[PDB]
Enzyme design. Structure first.
Site, mmCIF file in Angstrom:
data_model
loop_
_atom_site.group_PDB
_atom_site.id
_atom_site.type_symbol
_atom_site.label_atom_id
_atom_site.label_comp_id
_atom_site.label_asym_id
_atom_site.label_seq_id
_atom_site.Cartn_x
_atom_site.Cartn_y
_atom_site.Cartn_z
ATOM 1 N N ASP A 194 0.859 -1.169 0.000
ATOM 2 C CA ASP A 194 0.000 0.000 0.000
ATOM 3 C C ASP A 194 0.901 1.226 0.000
ATOM 4 O O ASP A 194 2.132 1.130 -0.008
ATOM 5 C CB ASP A 194 -0.983 -0.028 1.178
ATOM 6 C CG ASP A 194 -0.414 0.557 2.453
ATOM 7 O OD1 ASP A 194 0.820 0.526 2.625
ATOM 8 O OD2 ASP A 194 -1.218 1.038 3.290
ATOM 9 N N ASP A 196 1.199 5.061 1.981
ATOM 10 C CA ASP A 196 0.777 5.817 3.157
ATOM 11 C C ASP A 196 1.159 7.282 3.005
ATOM 12 O O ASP A 196 2.311 7.594 2.684
ATOM 13 C CB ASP A 196 1.422 5.254 4.430
ATOM 14 C CG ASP A 196 1.189 3.771 4.587
ATOM 15 O OD1 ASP A 196 0.032 3.439 4.886
ATOM 16 O OD2 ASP A 196 2.113 2.950 4.348
ATOM 17 N N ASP A 250 -3.544 4.747 2.314
ATOM 18 C CA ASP A 250 -3.950 5.283 3.603
ATOM 19 C C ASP A 250 -3.656 6.771 3.633
ATOM 20 O O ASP A 250 -2.539 7.199 3.327
ATOM 21 C CB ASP A 250 -3.224 4.585 4.749
ATOM 22 C CG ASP A 250 -3.644 3.151 4.896
ATOM 23 O OD1 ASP A 250 -4.787 2.837 4.472
ATOM 24 O OD2 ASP A 250 -2.842 2.373 5.458
HETATM 25 MN MN LIG Z 1 -0.962 1.536 5.114
HETATM 26 MN MN LIG Z 2 2.355 0.792 4.062
#
Ligand SMILES: [Mn+2]
Ligand SMILES: [Mn+2]
Ligand SMILES: [Mn+2]
Ligand code: NA
Length: 326
Positions: A194, A196, A250
């Site tokens: 992912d 962030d 995120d």
């Molecule tokens: Mn994350």
């Molecule tokens: Mn991450």
DNA sequence: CGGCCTACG
DNA sequence: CGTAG
DNA sequence: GCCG
């Protein structure tokens, strides 16, 4: 010569004991699937010690005096040195329980407790889950629909393109607000699960209410495949040659007064931050989270203007993000 | 033996 | 319950 | 599972 806490030693991303650390991390992960957080921590910590060593372990004698190496972790290393494989590790690897718990907990919206309940109900595959969508939250439905894309590593080239689209939305939502890349990419990783980002504004208080305004704008641009405050766990559409793929992103907002604490927390690694908070409380009597650092005797919060400030207030040598890969 | 990070959605 | 590092 |  090796301190007991991971936040007391540099840990680089690449190191000299990769195979040994990987094996110990299998056992840590398996312990987590069985709900033994203590065993998970010891195996994670032992693995991390090996990542911090300056050269390969070649003989069992080199484990003497290292923290978190007792009879069990030492035996794992011994078997790997002597035979190139550890039977306990391989038994975990091929076990139906380990493989299914790993598959299910990889799903966005599924934790160990849900995965375990499904396992006990006899479920084993993603298609098992798809052929019973009434048992699924909307979050889990999204995680299952997008599971294939989310299993594909995000590349650093993906990240820069994502950051520019987030910055454009953030700039309309609040001119002057900034976007900082955090997580594993800030620690130097070339790939990740992912992306962030940490968002703030230089004028304290101007960040209030910001994240809903950012999300509404990203949604209006057609970029949000799934979402839903100060933390947003999203699935984004990311362009690809002739198409696109789903990516977990995120987004976090912090007031600038708390930004060093939020940056420190969201940069990780996960084990580094658990160890840092444990060190803070147990060795220094101070309580650390992603908002601040509290002295419970004076009932005061430490003002920090930088991550360097925080390391200084905890009596720790500064580690740049690239050395926090515990 | 107790403890094992500490939050938010 | 999920999520995060 | 290990530290303290
Ligand atoms: Mn994350
Ligand atoms: Mn991450
Ligand atoms: Mn993580
Ligand atoms: Na999950």
């Amino acid at each position: 010569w090796m301190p007991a806490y991971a936040c007391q030693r540099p840990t680089p991303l690449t190191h000299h004991n990769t195979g040994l650390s990987e094996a110990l991390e299998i056992l840590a992960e398996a312990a987590g699937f069985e709900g033994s957080e203590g065993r998970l921590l010891t195996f994670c910590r032992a693995a991390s010690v090996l990542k911090a060593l300056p050269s390969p372990v070649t003989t069992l004698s080199q484990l003497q005096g290292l923290p978190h190496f007792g009879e069990h972790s030492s035996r794992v290393v011994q078997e790997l040195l002597e035979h190139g494989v550890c039977e306990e590790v391989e038994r975990v690897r091929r076990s139906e329980r380990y493989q299914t718990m790993k598959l299910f907990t990889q799903i966005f919206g599924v934790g160990v407790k849900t995965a375990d309940r499904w396992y006990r109900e006899g479920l084993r595959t993603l298609d098992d889950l798809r052929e019973q969508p009434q048992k699924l939250t909307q979050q889990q439905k999204a995680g299952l629909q997008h599971h294939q894309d989310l299993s594909t590593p995000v590349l650093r080239s993906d990240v820069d393109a994502l950051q520019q689209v987030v910055e454009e939305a953030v700039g309309q939502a609040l001119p002057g607000a900034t976007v900082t890349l955090t997580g594993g990419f800030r620690r130097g990783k070339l790939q990740g699960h992912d992306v962030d980002f940490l968002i703030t504004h230089p004028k304290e208080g101007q960040e209030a209410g910001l994240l809903p305004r950012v999300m509404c704008r990203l949604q209006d641009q057609g970029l949000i495949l799934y979402h839903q405050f100060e933390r947003s766990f999203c699935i984004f559409r990311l362009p690809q040659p002739g198409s696109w793929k789903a990516v977990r992103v995120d987004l976090v907002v912090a007031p600038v007064s708390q930004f060093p604490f939020a940056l420190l927390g969201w940069t990780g690694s996960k084990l580094f931050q658990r160890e840092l908070r444990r060190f803070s409380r147990k060795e220094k009597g101070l309580w650390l989270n992603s908002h601040g650092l509290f002295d419970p005797e004076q009932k005061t919060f430490f003002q920090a203007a930088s991550e360097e400030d925080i390391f200084r207030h905890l009596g720790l040598e500064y580690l740049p993000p690239e050395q926090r890969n515990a």
